[PDB]
Design a protein around this ligand. Structure first.
Ligand SMILES: CCCCCCCCCCCCCCCCCC(=O)OC[C@H](COP(=O)([O-])OCC(O)COP(=O)([O-])OC[C@@H](COC(=O)CCCCCCCCCCCCCCCCC)OC(=O)CCCCCCCCCCCCCCCCC)OC(=O)CCCCCCCCCCCCCCCCC
Ligand SMILES: CCCCCCCCCCCCCCCCCC(=O)OC[C@H](COP(=O)([O-])OCC(O)COP(=O)([O-])OC[C@@H](COC(=O)CCCCCCCCCCCCCCCCC)OC(=O)CCCCCCCCCCCCCCCCC)OC(=O)CCCCCCCCCCCCCCCCC
Ligand SMILES: CCCCCCCCCCCCCCCCCC(=O)OC[C@H](COP(=O)([O-])OCC(O)COP(=O)([O-])OC[C@@H](COC(=O)CCCCCCCCCCCCCCCCC)OC(=O)CCCCCCCCCCCCCCCCC)OC(=O)CCCCCCCCCCCCCCCCC
Ligand SMILES: CCCCCCCCCCCCCCCCCC(=O)OC[C@H](COP(=O)(O)OCCN)OC(=O)CCCCCCCCCCCCCCCCC
Ligand SMILES: CCCCCCCCCCCCCCCCCC(=O)OC[C@H](COP(=O)(O)OCCN)OC(=O)CCCCCCCCCCCCCCCCC
Ligand SMILES: CCCCCCCCCCCCCCCCCC(=O)OC[C@H](COP(=O)(O)OCCN)OC(=O)CCCCCCCCCCCCCCCCC
Ligand SMILES: CCCCCCCCCCCCCCCCCC(=O)OC[C@H](COP(=O)(O)OCCN)OC(=O)CCCCCCCCCCCCCCCCC
Ligand SMILES: CCCCCCCCCCCCCCCCCC(=O)OC[C@H](COP(=O)(O)OCCN)OC(=O)CCCCCCCCCCCCCCCCC
Ligand SMILES: Nc1nc2c(ncn2[C@H]2C[C@H](O)[C@@H](COP(=O)(O)OP(=O)(O)OP(=O)(O)O)O2)c(=O)[nH]1
Ligand SMILES: [Mg+2]
Lengths: 105, 172, 51, 345, 320, 98, 140, 120, 76
């Protein structure tokens, strides 16, 4: 904040819901709760410039956790290769992935 | 039932496209209500019923007031709809054609980017806690009564002030 | 600095209140009756209403 | 206008920017700007003239569009990073949306086309409140995100702001439009110095405010609406021509006035960051700003324009309009240059 | 300025101090027709404050010492010179007319402030709503010109609607030959140097413009000479008037407060009478303005603000 | 979700195009503003339900409140424009240029 | 287009005069369509025919200025065989100014364009030789 | 640019470390100039409200002078504190990174060979 | 108008101000139960060069046994 009345008086009008692992109703953690928890405690006390450099590992895990850009490419490459094999007929679906499995509780 | 949310959001885009093409404000309100209904169903599709139903009801009331004002003073002798001018239908059909062209380009050239046909619907619900109580969207807005004191007081003061604002504006 | 595209401007009024032409009161004219339950059948109430 | 609505509207006018500065959240800074806009609309439509209606409508649509581009940037950041802060890795597209929206919030060129229009047709007190108070909360948000901004588009926005402001100030005769174009040039200066050090940005903001308030007050004393109206000030109020000249020279940035100090230290740090071409172009356009200031001084103080008959009863009557705050702000806006190291952090 | 927003919120309500006799009654008539005695007797037997006709030296008599100041301080316009030569090439006629209108505006502000502050009604003589009669009489007699008429109309448009119209407008109908006979009887030679065409222009401007405009927004009290000439029937009718039209009905406490602020700040009363429209009849120039202003400043009691002039006996300057 | 979020972003872009490209109806301009309001609400809500950010669920309701109060103020201003001129046409609001 | 405008600086001056003229003509055309779009938006024409005519006139004028500026710059550099010299860009700047004056039909604008565009192109050459930064990243 | 330093109290005028600084001597050109500015402010106020310039409002001129010296003294204490911590952080960085600030061996005018340019 | 203004200031500013100051002292006087300081026979305190012209000459006019020790100590 441009003025720090919030830090001076110790009150928290909006500082308790800045991000995902902040105060959540009935202890329902948000998605990527641990991952950006690691990002904050990596970046705390070292400044913004140092946060971008030596906390690149923790940020890249969280950025791909929330957006799933790399994971969608993995699942699409599974599906794109799979239907490529079905056109040539050198692959068959298993029973449990085609709808006839033995369910478990 | 995988491209349901996608055809919903395409309906939202064409409603906003008609609103941007700007017919007479009665038909603009018609497009805005059908787009608000689409947005309600979209929020319902991605999750809790509370936010979608509230935005739906609020814009029922809001464009109720708006349509009252279009009948009041935002009117002319011959209203222009979408089909009143050849230009408006022209930009409407080029908007639909450009939307189809853009989604085909994003499907083909960029592969897995913002739009993926093979991956459509596979990334709709990311993670939901299967065993658990109090997960709906209304519980958070309810906790805004307790956890968000500052949000409650600024919203209440905004509406209070705005009552005073509209009184002084329409004081005449 | 008067040019051709800006020489038509007038200086703003001293009290910022402009003189406008009094617009015609667009009042609705309604034929109340004669085919009306409250007009007793043969009354042509030309009614000049605002709202 | 009763005291109840006066208190509500004035308290909301105060509360908006204070919420924006004090609040950490992008959402709360946006709603503080929103508070400021809703609070200041009725006072623009306070006089109930068609020009006031035009000014309020233009101001409202411009501010609403800027607010929604701000809100787009905030929601896009919250999608990208999951937080409510442009922290370090927010997208440059989002930041450019924020910068365009905040520039059109402020009224600097090429988003400057509404500011003379809005400040015209409104009373002088609300023009003062606009051109001083309304430009702190966007500066609060801009100062909050100084290292992340794109210096190229910052400098381009700044230099075109000063160019358009100087040219408009040269052309216009109405005092409110003159003040608006002076505002545009000064916001160009602050926006240019913004990425390198926000301390000099705040220093230039305070210097601009403390120069603009008493000049507006001198406009309030007789409702001197035009160059001719401020020209017969020698017959209306002759004891203030010297301070009018000094305030306009300080607005021009002539040494040894303290209004030279913000331009001088901004140029100093611009050379510290090696943008000499930028600083030179900015300084010559500041000279052009000083040109229309000097022409205004020539009209109002150094020459004596012809007066009319009823100014005799203007001299007959007595006035207590100049408040206690005018002289202090004028002296701090005129003779503060030897306190430059104390003014600079 | 003790009156303000704080005084209003602590309680200075004009509707609270308002009562039945708090009316603005303006007596009007021709150039010499029973006007001064009627107004003063109406005020005397109604308990109202009487304001006589605002002359050239009205501001001189109401500001500072109250003595009539010298002529180039008080406008450099002479009614006697206007009577002697109405078509003089210097531009005396429109200068006098604009000066008289602005003095009437000052008197109207004084009367409105007195009514809004004390609650006592006012009986004006020939207020601002009936000075365009003299404007149009000079214009139709060829004494002044169309630029002067336009300048007067612009000033009237700027200043007139910011105030409230009078509660009652009393008119005195006296024919032009009777007016001329009374003028001959009074004995001022400049006043006998008037024209029946000018007097007929005055009466025509009355009957064709002034009476209908006040008829649609206040109570009009046309009286002839013998219906006048005995100021008791007019007072009885004023007592039994019913004010059911005009903008006075919709006025409330805060509108009264803002009107009171505007009429107690004389700078914004006389602000729009000094518009810089450069008309040669009205504009003066730097050297003559400087000489007149410096002489006014070296006049006794006018060098500083009132209460700060040590030469007139003001005390405790160093502690205020 | 990425397709829907991109599509909602283009919905905001089209409504901003409508707002920036005026027609003779200030009411239609305000309606384009409300279309932007819808798009912002839906993107905020779907991000909240995607991330399960139960503490950020107040954000759509807050922007709902503030933007509909914007709508109320704009409607009052449009009533003032119509009382001035008889129509809400934006080319009648062009005499402050001088 | 960033790779394009970087490929302008790939070769020293006086070589690929056709390429330099083409790229400077393209940059002038971009500046012209921006300026013409601003002109038609701020000051609307009475019909779309003369509107697009005004766009075409501004685009052709700016493209001609850029074309003859780059052409004269390259030919002057290779006639004087002195590649890194600002006077060649000054001659090109006056060629651009004379094109502006010819399109505007006024020798006063021609001479003002000569002096101003020659100074601008000369200082551009000094900047690109001695490493001046127009929009620097903040370093202190 | 120094608001992010460690141990920075939020919205604090003069912290306790500032009490380690020498105070201004209360008769220095900065405070004397601030008092003269207050006197000029009072004189300007008298002229603008159209009173005698120095014969009127003596208590007002006194209050202006006192308020100006008060504000100037406390602002001067804050600025000396800020410049002190600026130089302190600069010197601390210098001793923290000595390899980035090597002590150059400046060499005398017996082995440096400056060019000579004759003016003829 | 002056008399009304002063009446309003008395009723809406002065009386509420005295009410708040009285409430402040009244709440403090219920929470504070002061730990009588230990007696120290400081040579500059409780000086008696001549007896007082009342009582025993050793008690002050407004003596309070709980808080005001004699030159010798507290009385309890
Ligand atoms: C001394 C210099 C500064 C004086 C400031 C006050 C000026 C003032 O009020 O003058 C009026 C008054 C004279 O007025 P008056 O004639 O008596 O009556 C008023 C008239 O009736 C009024 O008549 P009127 O109002 O009807 O019409 C007159 C009107 C008509 O209007 C005009 O004629 C308009 C003229 C326009 C053109 C000129 C514009 C102004 C130019 C200013 C300078 C600019 C260039 C200089 C360099 C750049 C500066 C930034 O104005 C004038 O003619 C001029 C009025 C102002 C003149 C004085 C200006 C002072 C400031 C500028 C000069 C000093 C600073 C710069 C130089 C510094 C050294 C290099 O002057 C003074 O009283 C001067 C002060 C004398 C006593 C000084 C005592 C000092 C005591 C110190 C110890 C005690 C304090 C200790 C504090 C610390 C404790 C720890
Ligand atoms: C730099 C970064 C990388 C590149 C980025 C992209 C390119 C950026 C280019 C920037 C420079 C051009 C800007 C043009 C703006 C519009 C000018 C205009 O025509 O207005 C007329 C228009 C009124 O038109 P009208 O009423 O029809 O008037 C009729 C004329 O009188 C009828 O007159 P006429 O019949 O004589 O017509 C002849 C016409 C023929 O000329 C044209 O059509 C335009 C030609 C302009 C050429 C100048 C640049 C040449 C560069 C050559 C480079 C060669 C290679 C490099 C080496 C050498 C480097 C020097 O001449 C004009 O129209 C001249 C107008 C005034 C131009 C003043 C330029 C000053 C700066 C020059 C250096 C830059 O006025 C306005 O619209 C005023 C408001 C302007 C609002 C925009 C303010 C910002 C402008 C800069 C934007 C920069 C990019 C975006 C940055 C971020 C902000 C969003
Ligand atoms: C009667 C009036 C004076 C009454 C004084 C009563 C109090 C007293 O006895 O004070 C003794 C007190 C004892 O001083 P100290 O502690 O022994 O140290 C004196 C040393 O010389 C050490 O002092 P320093 O020479 O190192 O000066 C300290 C330093 C820091 O001091 C300052 O910055 C103050 C400069 C004041 C001038 O000064 C500077 O940096 C000088 C800057 C000069 C360039 C400024 C450019 C701007 C334009 C000209 C100044 C502005 C005038 C008004 C606008 C008009 C422009 C034309 O003496 C002073 O305060 C000296 C100045 C007194 C006159 C002030 C100006 C009039
Ligand atoms: C950190 C940021 C601090 C604030 C910087 C920006 C200045 C904010 C000014 C807020 C007050 C503005 C205002 O209300 O202006 C209107 C008012 C009209 O004054 P007037 O009508 O003459 O009053 C007569 C009755 N008192 O005008 C005034 O009362 C003038 C007030 C000028 C204040 C200047 C402050 C400069 C900085 C200290
Ligand atoms: C994209 C930016 C440029 C778009 C230009 C569109 C045409 C235009 O200039 O329309 C102006 C028009 C002004 O409104 P109006 O009063 O109707 O004007 C009548 C014309 N004198 O404006 C309007 O009527 C407003 C129309 C708003 C439309 C918003 C949605 C546009 C969707 C299509 C985008 C462009 C697609 C281009 C495709 C090209 C081929 C691939
Ligand atoms: C070598 C000097 C070149 C000067 C070019 C220039 O700017 O000329 C300006 C001039 C203005 O046109 P104008 O004066 O109307 O006369 C044209 C009649 N051929 O335009 C011309 O003279 C244009 C002549 C044709 C183009 C020549 C290149
Ligand atoms: C970065 C790059 C920025 C470039 C900025 C400048 C762009 C080119 C010049 C544009 C000029 C536009 C205005 C114009 O035409 O000025 C010419 C002026 C008037 O000539 P006129 O015949 O009236 O033309 C009609 C008005 N356009 O004609 C004159 O005033 C005649 C002047 C003749 C002598 C000029 C000598 C040089 C002056 C400058 C020297 C600088 C060192
Ligand atoms: C009347 C003035 C009353 C001042 C009371 C104390 C105000 C205060 O605490 O100021 C501290 C403030 C912020 O200090 P800091 O934590 O360094 O924040 C960096 C933001 N510039 O410090 C600052 O803002 C420094 C600049 C203060 C300028 C004051 C005059 C304008
Ligand atoms: N030309 C001109 N003369 C005016 C104007 N107002 C007043 N006068 C003149 C007319 C008279 O000669 C003089 C006094 O005005 P009156 O109408 O009160 O005349 P008088 O008192 O002699 O007669 P009375 O018994 O009151 O009707 O002022 C004005 O606006 N224009
Ligand atoms: Mg009389």
């Amino acid at each position: 904040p441009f003025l720090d009345i919030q830090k001076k008086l110790g009150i928290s009008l909006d500082r308790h819901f800045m991000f995902l692992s902040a105060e959540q109703p009935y202890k329902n953690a948000a998605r990527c709760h641990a991952f950006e928890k690691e990002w904050i405690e990596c970046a705390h006390g070292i400044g913004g410039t140092r946060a971008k450099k030596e906390c690149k590992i923790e940020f890249d895990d969280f950025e791909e956790c929330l957006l799933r850009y790399k994971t969608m490419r993995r699942m699409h490459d599974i599906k794109k290769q799979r239907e490529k094999l079905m056109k040539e007929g050198k692959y068959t679906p298993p029973p449990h992935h085609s709808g006839r499995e033995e369910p478990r509780p | 039932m995988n491209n349901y949310i996608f055809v919903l959001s395409s309906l939202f885009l064409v409603g906003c496209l008609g609103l941007a093409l700007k017919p007479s404000p009665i038909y603009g309100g018609l497009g805005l209500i059908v787009s608000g209904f689409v947005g309600c169903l979209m929020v319902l599709g991605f999750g809790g019923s509370f936010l979608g139903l509230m935005v739906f009801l609020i814009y029922l009331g809001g464009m109720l007031v708006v349509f009252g004002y279009t009948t009041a003073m935002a009117t002319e002798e011959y209203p222009e709809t979408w089909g009143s001018n050849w230009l408006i239908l022209g930009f409407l059909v080029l908007g639909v054609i450009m939307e189809v062209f853009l989604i085909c380009v994003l499907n083909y050239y960029d592969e897995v980017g913002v739009i993926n046909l093979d991956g459509l619907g596979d990334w709709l619900m990311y993670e939901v806690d299967d065993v658990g109580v109090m997960l709906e969207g209304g519980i958070g807005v309810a906790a805004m009564y307790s956890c968000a004191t500052w949000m409650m007081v600024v919203a209440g003061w905004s509406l209070f002030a705005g009552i005073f604002i509209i009184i002084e504006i329409t004081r005449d | 600095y008067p040019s051709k595209e800006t020489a038509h401007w007038k200086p703003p009024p001293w009290n910022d209140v402009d003189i406008l032409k009094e617009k015609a009161v667009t009042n609705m004219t309604l034929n109340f009756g004669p085919q009306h339950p409250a007009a007793h059948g043969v009354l042509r109430l030309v009614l000049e209403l605002s709202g | 206008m009763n005291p109840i609505t006066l208190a509500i509207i004035y308290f909301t006018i105060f509360l908006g920017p204070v919420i924006t500065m004090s609040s950490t959240n992008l959402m709360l800074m946006w709603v503080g700007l929103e508070f400021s806009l809703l609070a200041i609309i009725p006072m623009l439509i306070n006089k109930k003239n068609p020009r006031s209606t035009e000014a309020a409508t233009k101001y409202f649509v411009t501010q609403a569009t800027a607010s929604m581009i701000i809100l787009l940037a905030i929601v896009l950041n919250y999608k990208q990073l999951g937080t409510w802060m442009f922290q370090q890795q927010t997208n440059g597209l989002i930041l450019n949306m924020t910068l365009m929206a905040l520039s059109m919030k402020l009224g600097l060129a090429p988003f400057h086309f509404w500011l003379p229009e809005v400040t015209q047709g409104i009373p002088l007190h609300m023009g003062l409140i606009l051109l001083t108070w309304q430009k702190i909360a966007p500066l609060s948000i801009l100062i909050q995100i100084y290292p992340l901004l794109n210096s190229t588009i910052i400098l381009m926005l700044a230099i075109t702001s000063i160019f358009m402001g100087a040219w408009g100030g040269l052309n216009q005769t109405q005092m409110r439009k003159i003040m608006a174009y002076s505002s545009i040039a000064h916001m160009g200066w602050m926006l240019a110095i913004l990425p390198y050090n926000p301390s000099l940005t705040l220093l230039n903001l305070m210097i601009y405010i403390i120069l603009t308030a008493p000049m507006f007050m001198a406009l309030m004393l007789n409702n001197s609406m035009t160059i001719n109206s401020i020209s017969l000030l020698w017959n209306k109020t002759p004891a203030m021509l010297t301070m009018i000249s000094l305030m306009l020279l300080s607005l021009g940035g002539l040494p040894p006035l303290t209004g030279f100090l913000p331009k001088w230290i901004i140029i100093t740090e611009l050379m510290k960051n090696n943008c000499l071409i930028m600083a030179t172009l900015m300084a010559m356009m500041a000279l052009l700003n000083l040109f229309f200031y000097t022409r205004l001084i020539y009209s109002t103080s150094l020459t004596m324009f012809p007066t009319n008959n009823n100014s005799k009863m203007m001299t007959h009557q007595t006035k207590t309009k100049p408040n206690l705050m005018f002289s202090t702000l004028a002296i701090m806006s005129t003779m503060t240059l030897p306190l430059a190291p104390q003014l600079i952090t | 300025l003790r009156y303000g927003l704080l005084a209003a919120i602590l309680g200075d309500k004009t509707t609270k101090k308002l009562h039945e006799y708090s009316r603005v009654i303006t007596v009007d008539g021709n150039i010499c027709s029973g006007k001064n005695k009627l107004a003063k007797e109406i005020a005397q037997q109604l308990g109202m404050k009487h304001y006589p006709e605002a002359g050239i030296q009205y501001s001189s008599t109401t500001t500072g010492d109250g003595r009539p100041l010298d002529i180039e301080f008080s406008g450099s316009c002479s009614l006697e010179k206007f009577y002697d030569d109405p078509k003089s090439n210097d531009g005396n006629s429109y200068r006098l007319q604009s000066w008289l209108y602005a003095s009437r505006l000052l008197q109207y502000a004084d009367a409105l402030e007195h009514l809004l502050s004390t609650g006592q009604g006012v009986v004006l003589e020939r207020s601002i709503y009936s000075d365009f009669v003299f404007l149009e009489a000079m214009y139709n007699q060829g004494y002044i010109r169309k630029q002067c008429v336009d300048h007067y109309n612009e000033i009237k448009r700027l200043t007139l609607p910011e105030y409230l119209p009078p509660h009652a407008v009393i008119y005195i109908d006296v024919p032009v030959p009777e007016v001329q006979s009374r003028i001959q009887k009074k004995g001022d030679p400049h006043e006998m140097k008037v024209t029946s065409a000018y007097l007929q222009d005055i009466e025509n401007a009355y009957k064709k413009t002034f009476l209908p405009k006040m008829s649609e927004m206040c109570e009009v009290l046309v009286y002839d000479s013998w219906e006048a000439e005995d100021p008791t029937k007019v007072v009885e009718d004023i007592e039994y008037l019913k004010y059911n039209k005009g903008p006075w009905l919709k006025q409330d406490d805060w509108t009264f407060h803002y009107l009171r602020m505007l009429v107690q700040d004389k700078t914004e009363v006389l602000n729009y009478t000094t518009i810089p429209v450069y008309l040669p009849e009205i504009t003066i120039g730097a050297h003559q303005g400087s000489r007149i202003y410096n002489s006014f400043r070296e006049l006794p009691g006018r060098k500083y603000a009132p209460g700060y002039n040590a030469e007139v006996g003001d005390k405790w300057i160093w502690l205020k | 979700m990425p397709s829907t979020f991109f599509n909602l972003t283009m919905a905001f872009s089209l409504s901003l195009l409508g707002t920036l490209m005026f027609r003779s109806h200030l009411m239609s301009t305000l309606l384009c503003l409300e279309g932007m309001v819808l798009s912002l609400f839906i993107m905020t809500s779907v991000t909240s339900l995607n991330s399960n950010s139960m503490s950020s669920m107040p954000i759509p309701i807050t922007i709902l409140v503030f933007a509909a109060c914007e709508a109320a103020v704009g409607l009052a201003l449009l009533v003032k424009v119509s009382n001035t001129y008889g129509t809400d046409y934006v080319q009648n609001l062009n005499l402050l240029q001088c | 287009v960033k790779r394009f405008f970087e490929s302008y600086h790939e070769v020293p001056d006086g070589t690929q005069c056709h390429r330099k003229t083409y790229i400077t003509t393209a940059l002038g055309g971009i500046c012209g369509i921006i300026g013409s779009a601003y002109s038609v938006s701020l000051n609307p024409a009475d019909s779309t025919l003369e509107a697009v005519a005004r766009v075409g006139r501004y685009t052709f004028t700016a493209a001609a200025i850029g074309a003859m500026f780059g052409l004269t710059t390259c030919v002057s550099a290779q006639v004087r065989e002195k590649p890194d010299d600002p006077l060649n860009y000054f001659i090109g700047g006056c060629a651009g100014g004379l094109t502006l004056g010819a399109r505007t039909h006024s020798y006063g604008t021609a001479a003002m364009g000569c002096v101003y565009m020659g100074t601008a192109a000369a200082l551009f050459k000094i900047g690109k030789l001695e490493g001046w930064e127009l929009f620097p990243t903040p370093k202190v | 640019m120094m608001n992010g330093r460690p141990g920075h109290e939020p919205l604090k005028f003069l912290p306790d470390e500032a009490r380690s600084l020498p105070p201004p001597k209360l008769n220095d050109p900065r405070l004397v100039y601030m008092g003269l500015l207050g006197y000029c402010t009072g004189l300007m106020d008298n002229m603008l409200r159209m009173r005698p310039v120095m014969r009127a409002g003596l208590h007002r001129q006194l209050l202006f002078v006192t308020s100006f010296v008060f504000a100037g003294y406390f602002y001067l204490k804050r600025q000396n504190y800020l410049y002190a911590v600026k130089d302190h952080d600069m010197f601390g960085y210098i001793k923290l990174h000595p390899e980035d600030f090597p002590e150059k061996e400046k060499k005398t005018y017996a082995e440096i060979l400056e060019p000579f340019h004759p003016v003829r | 108008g002056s008399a009304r203004m002063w009446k309003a200031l008395t009723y809406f500013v002065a009386l509420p101000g005295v009410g708040v100051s009285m409430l402040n002292v009244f709440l403090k006087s219920r929470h504070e139960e002061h730990e009588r300081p230990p007696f120290v026979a400081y040579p500059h305190l409780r000086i008696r060069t001549k007896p007082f012209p009342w009582g025993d000459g050793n008690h002050t006019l407004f003596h309070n046994p709980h808080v005001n020790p004699l030159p010798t100590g507290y009385e309890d």
